[PDB]
Design a protein around this ligand. Sequence first.
Ligand code: HEM
Ligand SMILES: O=C1N[C@@H](Cc2ccc(O)c(F)c2)C(=O)N[C@H]1Cc1ccc(O)cc1
Length: 393
Amino acid sequence: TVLLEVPFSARGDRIPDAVAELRTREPIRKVRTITGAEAWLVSSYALCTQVLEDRRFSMKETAAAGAPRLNALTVPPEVVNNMGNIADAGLRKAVMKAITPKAPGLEQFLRDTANSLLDNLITEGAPADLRNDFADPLATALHCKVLGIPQEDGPKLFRSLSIAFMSSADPIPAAKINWDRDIEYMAGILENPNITTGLMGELSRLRKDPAYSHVSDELFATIGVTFFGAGVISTGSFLTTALISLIQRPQLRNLLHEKPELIPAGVEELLRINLSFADGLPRLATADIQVGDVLVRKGELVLVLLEGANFDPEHFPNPGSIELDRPNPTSHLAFGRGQHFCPGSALGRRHAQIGIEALLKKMPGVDLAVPIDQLVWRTRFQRRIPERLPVLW
Ligand code: HEM
Ligand SMILES: O=C1N[C@@H](Cc2ccc(O)c(F)c2)C(=O)N[C@H]1Cc1ccc(O)cc1
């Protein structure tokens, strides 16, 4: 027998029975990654929270040369410390303020965009592909608006993502080509006088403010590339798999259609049960640290399995069921926890809430147009997503 390999399954419509067996028997245990490295896979709520809240389990140290790797880097090593670099530049407050869903008109733009996408699918007739022709275009349009960049530039930036978020054993030549091109695009945006709104408009102003005169042009461009990429891949993939979970639950679909004020609670449960992250969150130990029955040694890789935490019955009883009245509804780990908690969490919630509200109003009869087993799940990728999501209504 060989050492247990991760990831277990690229299917995003169901959790393997294996996760519950593992959490019960060995909530921290040694696995092999796709690179051949060994790692500790953590799968209980208690131990996942412990790792994420202890900064001695470091995300920037995962990029060190010679470290055991979950996958190959698709960005320059310094970008693994992206939020640390942003904070060190004095930019964290401005960046986080620009990516909230609170800017005037933003939520209306989201609703208008969702409704337009859905009207076009209704005109064309069933079947419709809710990933490529709804959820991903909605994420792309949102992030162009949030960044302040032209909508027509969205698709080209989007098409970098099927490579940029690969989970590969080896470096990916195309990832560098696309990264360098996207950095050049964002550098041009910062020099473009017509870009005055959104995140890039704000960074463009701060770039010429004496208080930021020593912040590198490379960092400013990197913020644009990285926030577009992480935001689009994360919101598009989450919404897509949330739609499957909703379609699989006609009673829930009808409840949210009938009572749209329950959509936020519904989205929070869809977040909790979401399988969009294809790999555990990686951290490198910077000291010898006890985690359950294992003494993790300095220099070892730890993988925090989000669905391990989020389906843990000790924290979320009847964990496979969507229940809108849980006492601890936001205590899931869908956005991470601790130092690296997702800075786009509010925007991600709103993207999904508006998308779902619009879908349920326009397509109350939405159902899969193919048997669920026919969905094609993307492999060796940092998200779990079906290549196409064919629906009828
Ligand atoms: C539903 C949508 C989203 C989900 C499920 C999600 C999930 C996550 C998770 C789990 C992390 C933690 C990674 C780790 O600790 O290793 C994270 C970090 C991050 N997310 Fe999100 N995210 C979403 C939306 C967004 C959006 C909209 C943006 C930007 C617009 C964004 C940008 C980031 C960035 C930059 C980080 C790194 C933060 C750091 O290292 O401190 N995400 N996200
Ligand atoms: O390595 C990082 N890189 C970017 C994210 C990123 C990755 C690849 C890209 O091509 C891109 F545009 C953006 C970031 O901000 N933080 C760290 C840690 C990290 C990784 C994955 C992740 O999903 C979220 C965070």
